[PDB]
Amino acid sequence: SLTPRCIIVRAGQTEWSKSGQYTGLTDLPLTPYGEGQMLRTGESVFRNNQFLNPDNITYIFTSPRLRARQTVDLVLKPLSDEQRAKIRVVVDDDLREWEYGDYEGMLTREIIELRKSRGLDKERPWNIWRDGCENGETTQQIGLRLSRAIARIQNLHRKHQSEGRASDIMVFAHGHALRYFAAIWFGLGVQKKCETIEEIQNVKSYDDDTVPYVKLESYRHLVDNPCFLLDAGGIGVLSYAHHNIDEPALELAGPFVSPPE
Amino acid sequence: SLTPRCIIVRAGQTEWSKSGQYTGLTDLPLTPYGEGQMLRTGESVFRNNQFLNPDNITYIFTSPRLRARQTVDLVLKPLSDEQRAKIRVVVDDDLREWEYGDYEGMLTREIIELRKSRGLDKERPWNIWRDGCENGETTQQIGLRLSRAIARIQNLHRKHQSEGRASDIMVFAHGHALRYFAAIWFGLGVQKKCETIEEIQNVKSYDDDTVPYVKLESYRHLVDNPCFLLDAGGIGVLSYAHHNIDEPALELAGPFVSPPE
Numbered sequence: 106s107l108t109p110r111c112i113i114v115r116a117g118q119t120e121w122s123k124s125g126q127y128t129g130l131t132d133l134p135l136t137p138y139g140e141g142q143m144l145r146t147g148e149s150v151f152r153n154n155q156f157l158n159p160d161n162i163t164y165i166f167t168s169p170r171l172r173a174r175q176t177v178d179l180v181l182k183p184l185s186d187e188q189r190a191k192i193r194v195v196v197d198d199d200l201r202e203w204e205y206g207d208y209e210g211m212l213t214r215e216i217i218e219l220r221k222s223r224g225l226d227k228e229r230p231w232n233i234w235r236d237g238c239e240n241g242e243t244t245q246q247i248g249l250r251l252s253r254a255i256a257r258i259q260n261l262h263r264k265h266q267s268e269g270r271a272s273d274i275m276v277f278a279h280g281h282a283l284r285y286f287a288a289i290w291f292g293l294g295v296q297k298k299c300e301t302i303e304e305i306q307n308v309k310s311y312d313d314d315t316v317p318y319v320k321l322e323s324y325r326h327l328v329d330n331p332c333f334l335l336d337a338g339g340i341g342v343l344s345y346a347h348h349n350i351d352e353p354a355l356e357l358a359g360p361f362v363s364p365p366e
Numbered sequence: 367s368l369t370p371r372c373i374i375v376r377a378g379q380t381e382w383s384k385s386g387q388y389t390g391l392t393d394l395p396l397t398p399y400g401e402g403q404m405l406r407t408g409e410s411v412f413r414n415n416q417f418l419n420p421d422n423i424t425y426i427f428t429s430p431r432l433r434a435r436q437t438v439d440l441v442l443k444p445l446s447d448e449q450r451a452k453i454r455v456v457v458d459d460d461l462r463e464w465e466y467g468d469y470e471g472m473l474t475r476e477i478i479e480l481r482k483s484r485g486l487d488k489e490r491p492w493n494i495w496r497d498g499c500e501n502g503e504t505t506q507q508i509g510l511r512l513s514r515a516i517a518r519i520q521n522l523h524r525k526h527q528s529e530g531r532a533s534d535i536m537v538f539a540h541g542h543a544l545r546y547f548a549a550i551w552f553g554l555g556v557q558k559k560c561e562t563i564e565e566i567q568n569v570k571s572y573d574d575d576t577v578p579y580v581k582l583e584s585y586r587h588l589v590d591n592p593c594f595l596l597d598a599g600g601i602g603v604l605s606y607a608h609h610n611i612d613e614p615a616l617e618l619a620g621p622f623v624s625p626p627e
């Protein structure tokens with residue numbers, strides 16, 4: 106039975122994403138162009154190309170942000186009611202974007218100028234993946250919460266493979282969160298034992314009894330840029346080598362596969 | 367003008383690749399199924415989806431192996447004579463597969479059995495990315511030659527971007543070589559100064575005067591599995607963040623892009 110996959114999908118275009126402004130918590134909608142964009146994406150992957158087979162989708166995880174949720178609706182439009190009824194949708198707060206704090210709605214170069222004026226970054230340039238954001242999340246905070254979601258997804262994958270089913274699980278989220286998610290999925294960054302109060306607690310970030318909570322002994326986080334590109338409405342694919350959930354791997358073809366004979 | 371890209375393409379199916387046998391120097395052809403498969407891939411990326419625009423392809427680099435070259439022919443079949451005339455094709459020996467030496471045409475598990483019988487791998491399992499192959503290439507050796515090709519390609523990218531043109535450069539090669547190639551492209555592994563006689567010399571691995579040779583001061587190589595999947599006839603995409611050749615990045619969407627408005 107087909108190796109399980111995690112399909113990452115970045116929210117479609119917003120007014121801020123279009124112009125490079127850091128959109129974290131701000132609950133922006135898709136632009137009219139972004140709606141069209143995500144509609145076309147859904148048609149490409151389901152109808153025109155069959156890069157995804159609905160019969161194989163088991164779970165869709167989404168950030169609680171409007172633009173992620175809108176992206177789920179538009180991308181899944183090509184499905185029949187029957188196909189939809191068999192797919193479970195779960196809103197997971199662990200998949201929200203990096204909390205930018207003071208940097209919300211700013212540009213990269215504005216962030217650099219703001220920090221320089223606070224007297225930081227004297228020895229080396231700011232690097233979100235190492236430093237986090239003043240009044241927002243550190244890298245260990247985002248790494249921790251994405252690890253918990255990854256553990257939940259990989260646990261469903263293992264449960265499904267052992268029930269003899271295919272399992273594509275979709276994750277709709279954001280540009281930083283998803284690059285980060287992909288990075289640790291396949292082993293980037295460092296391993297950190299769960300020890301502090303923050304690191305151990307059940308957070309209760311989603312509400313859906315069919316998704317077992319997995320309590321982490323340890324987690325991964327980044328200390329440097331993993332150097333990924335993922336555009337607004339871009340799609341990436343995470344899976345496993347040799348049908349083995351213990352060998353998570355990055356699919357270099359993203360969602361592309363050669364057309365069947 | 368569009369950020370330059372390197373489009374990696376793995377040779378289509380062979381009799382050995384279908385069955386997991388390590389195909390290095392052995393000059394196998396595509397199976398009949400593999401031909402069909404690469405023909406359909408070409409139509410998907412140029413005609414049915416336009417994931418690739420021929421007007422933007424400047425160079426195609428290919429391993430000297432028959433199966434890679436055959437893959438070039440079939441994937442580019444949808445192009446007109448006019449489009450082909452403007453694209454330069456370069457055979458580059460630096461893009462050959464990992465030299466397997468003793469392991470040629472063997473299965474992973476056979477290689478493990480063979481090594482265990484020579485009394486190796488007592489402390490930890492064989493890991494090609496660290497250990498290389500008896501009578502074949504070390505990881506340094508492959509990392510060095512792939513680094514030279516990367517430098518040549520990125521130098522053409524920089525020359526083109528500074529001439530104001532788009533540049534998609536395709537690289538047709540092999541499963542280990544391309545995963546390795548992708549891993550170091552975006553900064554995995556370690557930096558090693560060029561110092562030994564091997565590391566410094568001009569090897570003359572291609573013959574095309576329009577490709578400036580770049581003499582490396584230093585190179586990258588892996589010391590561990592980068593955990594990528596890339597199937598036979600799989601397509602990946604390497605590029606740069608912020609239109610900057612000094613920021614090479616992995617495209618998580620491989621060749622997928624949402625259909626234009």
Ligand SMILES: O=C(COP(=O)(O)O)[C@H](O)[C@@H](O)C(O)COP(=O)(O)O
Nearest residue numbers: 116122125126127128202279280281
């Ligand atoms: O804030 C966004 C994420 O949220 P969504 O737009 O996905 O909601 C993006 O990740 C970009 O604004 C961004 O900073 C890209 O930074 P880069 O790494 O290119 O220097």
Ligand SMILES: O=C(COP(=O)(O)O)[C@H](O)[C@@H](O)C(O)COP(=O)(O)O
Nearest residue numbers: 377383386387388389463540541542
């Ligand atoms: O020899 C091949 C490359 O040659 P082409 O078939 O691409 O020429 C492949 O790289 C396979 O042999 C292979 O071992 C996959 O290893 P894995 O990582 O799955 O454990």
